[PDB]
Amino acid sequence: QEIFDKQRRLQELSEKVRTCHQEASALRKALQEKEAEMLQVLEDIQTI
Amino acid sequence: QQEIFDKQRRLQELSEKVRTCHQEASALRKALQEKEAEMLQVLEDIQTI
Amino acid sequence: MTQQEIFDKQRRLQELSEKVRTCHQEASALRKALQEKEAEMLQVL
Amino acid sequence: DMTQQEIFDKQRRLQELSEKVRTCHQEASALRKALQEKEAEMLQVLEDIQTI
């Protein structure tokens, strides 16, 4: 399909992948932080 | 009886905190589910070049 | 009776609470693994 | 730059690394689904205690 057009596709796609990673990397931290907050609440519930 | 009511009230306050943390987590998971697949979606395309 | 019931519910609540803790710690190890796995891929890119 | 062969070579390296991510993702979906229901089970038990 012409190597220059293949190089262009590779670039755009890689960028999109890095963007998805950076986004996912921050969603996991937010999820890990949120689950950690819930555990403190649950500990308190065992006390009544 | 009063004791039960108190226990219930306390459980309810903590329950509200649990619900809020769940609602966010439930949504955070959906956002993470869709995003990780979007990543895999592209990686697949990269293999199609 | 009502009391017994509240107690049973409380116990079940404790079971799930510990089960959530297990899943969380299990998720924490997976997220760290997924982190390095993606980063390993990025380097390749 | 980058030649076609260079692209194929990076495409193969990718495949092995991408497959591992695919696996970890499927495992993450299973845990999240399991965690989702467990938290839902808790809220229903909490609401269950509110009734006598």
Neighbours of A21 (CB within 10 A): 20
Joined together, the tokens standing for residue D26 give: 């499927």
Q: Which of residues 2-31 of A touch C (CB under 8 A)?
A: 14, 17-18, 21, 24-25, 28, 31
Quick one: closest CA in C to B1, which residue? C3
Probe site for chain D from A4, A5, A7 (most D CB atoms < 10 A): A7
Residues B37, D28, A17, B45, CA torsion sign: negative
The answer to whether B22 touches A34, Cβ cutoff 8 Å, is no
The answer to whether A18 touches B12, Cβ cutoff 8 Å, is no
The b/e string for D26-39 (b: 16+ C-beta within 10 A; e otherwise) is eebeebbebbbebb
Picking from C9, B29, D33, B10, the residue whose alpha carbon sits closest to that of residue A35 is B29
Determine the Cα–Cα distance for residues D50 and B5; give it in Å rounded to an integer.
Answer: 9
Instruction: Using CB atoms, list chains with 3+ pairs below 8 Å to chain D.
Output: A, B, C
Expt. technique: X-ray
Place of tokens 């589910």: B33
Give resolution in angstroms.
Answer: 2.5
Instruction: Using CB atoms, list chains with 3+ pairs below 8 Å to chain A.
Output: B, C, D
Place of tokens 């890095």: A18
